[model samples]
Target: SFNIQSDDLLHHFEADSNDTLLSAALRAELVFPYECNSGGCGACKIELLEGEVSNLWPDAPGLAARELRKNRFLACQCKPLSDLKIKVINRAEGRASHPPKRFSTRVVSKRFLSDEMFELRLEAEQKVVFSPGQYFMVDVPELGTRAYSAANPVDGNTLTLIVKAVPNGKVSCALANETIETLQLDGPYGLSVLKTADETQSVFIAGGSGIAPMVSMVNTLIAQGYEKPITVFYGSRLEAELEAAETLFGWKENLKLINVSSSVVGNSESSYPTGYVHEIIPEYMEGLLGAEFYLCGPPQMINSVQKLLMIENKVPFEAIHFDRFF
Candidate 1:
């Protein structure tokens, strides 16, 4: 427990980190790990020389889930929370790749998430490789291609999806009513894929049908035994619209910040966050500097949060990632 320099502040008692870290370089008059650009340039790979640090953003935008379990944090997004040791890698690593693939699956089940929101399960003809947080486009004969996120991790060929029934919406109704027989799945699409890193905290904000990807992300993290704190803010019109919440609860490990917000609440529940989901983000994150945000919902909510993070919190654009459900 050498952690406390015996003071109140996390860094005040400790000496300048660069000074201590660079002492050897100074003596040898050599350069150190200059670093990568953007949120990730995962150079450190397996090179942990010493101490521990926290990510400025909880998203851990880079390094897949496998890397996160190894106690690795990207140097670009790091903030030293305590004094100690660290080994910086002078070399940079390439981003791992996942090529999009297709799947032929059939509806095995359709269950209610909320009264109108449903979780649709598909049994694929073969195995599919996709990280959590990726969505698939299902080909509906007449309604065209509709994109939906997988709610669970890639387990064999079985897949779970989140579906919200829009009023008189043809495709939405078909999926929920068991009208479709065979489903043509065309992706593992979307930008909000998971990364491996436990050093940062995560905040997920979704509204209406947008909760699909959030469910994928949450389940993936919990399955991986994510120990870092995570918060979810899901918004709907009325509390009655959030019937699917029990499924979210099933995915929880130590995550306690699951909030369902609605604009039309007749009776107040302390667990609920009122109003639009974006409105509650700032309060939950306490300013968003060092946290990663996965936002999905209506275009309006997505636009609103971009400004909130950029204008108010000054959060790096790289740290704020989103998808707008049409």
Candidate 2:
């Protein structure tokens, strides 16, 4: 067992011979930044503020030579040699809260929405309370953990997940072709919550499966009787990918849903723009000067949209919230 300490929390975990720092921290209920658990994403870099750790994967795929000189280590590739105090590098935005530890779960049902996307209904071993727009890391035990947003808020004892089939992604590929009756998940991890519901109107931008958390947030708002005008811009490669259109349409009285299909192959719906979704935003949205924007999607898409919102539309940098999944 090892004692791990974060800025405001302390936890203990029994370490196995092969447990890495990231795995141990996760086991101890700590929320850390990471993607591509195989160390392809540099999101889990941390500073060894105190204590020693042995690099389990010294030539970690994500580590750079410069990072090594700066005392930065990839948490997913190292194991603590003693009690540790590490500084999380890719910390959450604003005043974020720690997510609950991973838990074992079972797939209650699966619904195929499109040829490339499916909705997984998951039942947790225990109840989990998570803010809208957060994601859970689903681990297939021996395989690995991959992040997926909860499509709906935690209600009673179950939560819903929206997953898209990535071409070569282990988790998505497995779920796409077969039925997963049992799985383990660790999360409610992400900082994409509605920080405040002041007088400012909300604009949500999502792409493909990125719509999951946005849908969850909108549902939460509707349930709480929040009357803030929400405008959602959803982008997909094809019309079929916009599976959540009906749900957004149902909330038409309180929300505005704009669907964009940037098809590489020309389709009948050519009246809708043919370029990037970010390009269409400036043309369609008359004024974004004072609106609060929340965006979630691929890193490039979010970054491009963020630039348009902040530089072109003059939306304040502080009001722009983004959760980029690289």
Candidate 3:
């Protein structure tokens, strides 16, 4: 047995078995950042303040020599050897007033938005309220928790999620083919909410299914009668891939939607702009001054857009907010 302390809160977990720090935290109802629980992603890196731990997978691809020297260990890769005080490295500034908890949800409906994507509507056994952009981990018992963005804000009992089917992914592939209803979820994790409603302007950049959070955000803002000039730059490889563009266009009265399509297959007619999304951002944002930017997309897209916004456009780092999907 081992005692784990975080942010002054202490919990006990049996270390004789094969339980990891992440599993212990989750079992203790402590939400932590993690993705690819198989130890491929380094999202769960934490500082070991005291006690001993053994790395279950010393050859984890995400582990590095420098991080090990700094006493950094992957929460998913380490098994507690003694009572420990570990610090969540990337702890957010403010504590969640209503932290996320586990829930039982049933798939009420599923709609095919695109050839590769589906809009999943999960009806909670009870009301599940969460801020926009926060995600949930759908647990499949022995399989593991699969993280997904909540497409609907904290409005009612119905929770929406936009899921894209990965080619060979176990969970996504199962979801893509079957219409299984009941599933267990643990979340309301992720800090992707807008800190304040007062800003000069709000800018949103999204790619593919990354539009889920932005949709929820815009819907929330519209409901609150927030009429600040909101602009969105959404990118996809094909016109069909930009499934949410039509919905965004319908909101033209309050928000401005800019759709960019990068055609790798061939040149096709699109309602909005053409070429890579990042390529045309500079032109569109030229002369536009002082706006808060929110970005959600593939890691490569976020990295490129962030570099363009920060290095080239000279947008202040403080004004730009982004979260990468693993």
Candidate 4:
């Protein structure tokens, strides 16, 4: 084991030769800034103060040219080659709500939700505990670790993940085309969890595979017998591509499901709303007063919706919760 110390937080953790600095810190329950756990997002960048580390993804896009000049490294993509001390650029306060642990998981099932989307269910060696909107960092065999939101509320050893087959995406393509069985999953990491204690109405906006975490939140709300008004704005390229339609449509009494499609002409006869997911929210602003917003989608969609809420509608920053899906 290697000693990993954070200079700012004065926290010490141990990392195996094969462990990434981010995972080690997270496993030790320290709040390190991170998102998209993969090498894509630069949110986990840290400055090494001493010692050496091995780069897992030398050409990872998360590191900007300016950052490279400053010797900034992505915690998610680097392993300790020796005892190391580092300075976290943005250290989060306190520890994680539920500290992450590595689990041995086996693929119990895989079902295609659409031509481009699929549901992958795995059975962990032990009971998996996680908040509704949290996700797991799955270590794929040939590909690297990738983040996928839990599509189902925690239930014993079962874990369900929704994956979108992005063209040329390494892990996604491998998941879509290959028949791998066992995997190592480290997670339950994310901050966009459902705030069931709050009495305000809850509104969820999702696009494509972004529905995974929203579905988890809705299921959690239903399981808790929540009586508050709930609304979900789900969008895809076409009606058939909208994942989990039957599940979301089944709750009718206090819930509303608005299906949105990107193409207006492709599904001309369909009654579904046609526009970006964020575009449909303004039309229903009257009914969404005092409602907390939860969003999961591509960065572009998240940025647009956040701008609309914060700038135009003036929604409180705390009321809008989201985790960017790269």
Clashing pairs in 4: none
Order of quality (TM-score): 4, 2, 3, 1
lDDT of each residue in 1-326, candidate 2, tens digit only: 56656673345454554567776666565656764445656777888888888886677768898988888899877787778887778863332354446578888988877778778888876786788877777877555677788778558668787778888888788877877788887666665676554636778888877778887887777677767687888888866776455453336476877778777775544355556779778875675446778898676788889888777767777787776665
Tell me the number of clashing residue pairs for each predicted model.
16, 1, 0, 0
Which residue runs does candidate 2 get wrong by more than 4 Å?
A: 4-44, 49-51, 54-63, 76-78, 85-98, 248-252, 265-271
Candidate 2 weakest lDDT stretch, 10 residues: 91-100
Q: What lDDT does each candidate get? A: 0.61, 0.72, 0.73, 0.82
Arrange candidates, best lDDT first.
4, 3, 2, 1
Better of 1 and 3 by TM-score: 3
Per-residue lDDT tens digits for candidate 3, residues 1-326, read 68777773444444444567876666565566765455656878888999899987777777788888899899878889888888877652333334556779998888877777778889887788777767777866554557787777676778888877777877876776886869888766665665554467778888887787787777776667676777888888857766455653335465878788875654445456777668878886864578888888587688889999998888997887665675
Supply the global lDDT for candidate 4.
0.82
Model 1: per-residue Cα lDDT over 1-326, one tens digit each: 22212121113123234322222221222333322222343533333345566554446455677666767555445555565455444442222134445568888887786668887889987786677766776878877556778787778888888888888887888787765668987655444566655337777777788777777777778887887777777777757555455456445566754555665545434456567766777676563447777777677787877888888777786676666664
Residue 179 CA displacement from its true place in model 3, Å: 2.1
Give the C-alpha lDDT of model 1. Answer: 0.61
- Candidate 2 lDDT (Cα, whole model)? 0.72
List the lowest-lDDT window of 10 residues for candidate 1: 1-10
lDDT of 2 at 111: 80
Q: Compared with the true structure, what per-residue lDDT tens digits does model 4 show for residues 1-326?
A: 99988766646989988778988888876778887677877878999889998888888899987887787899989999999989888756334578788889999898887778888999997898998889998878767678899888779999998899998888987888889888798887876788865647999888888888988889888877888999988888756666356554346478888888885456434567677877888989877888989989788788888998999887898788877887
Q: Give me the displacement of residue 285 in model 3, in angstroms.
A: 1.8
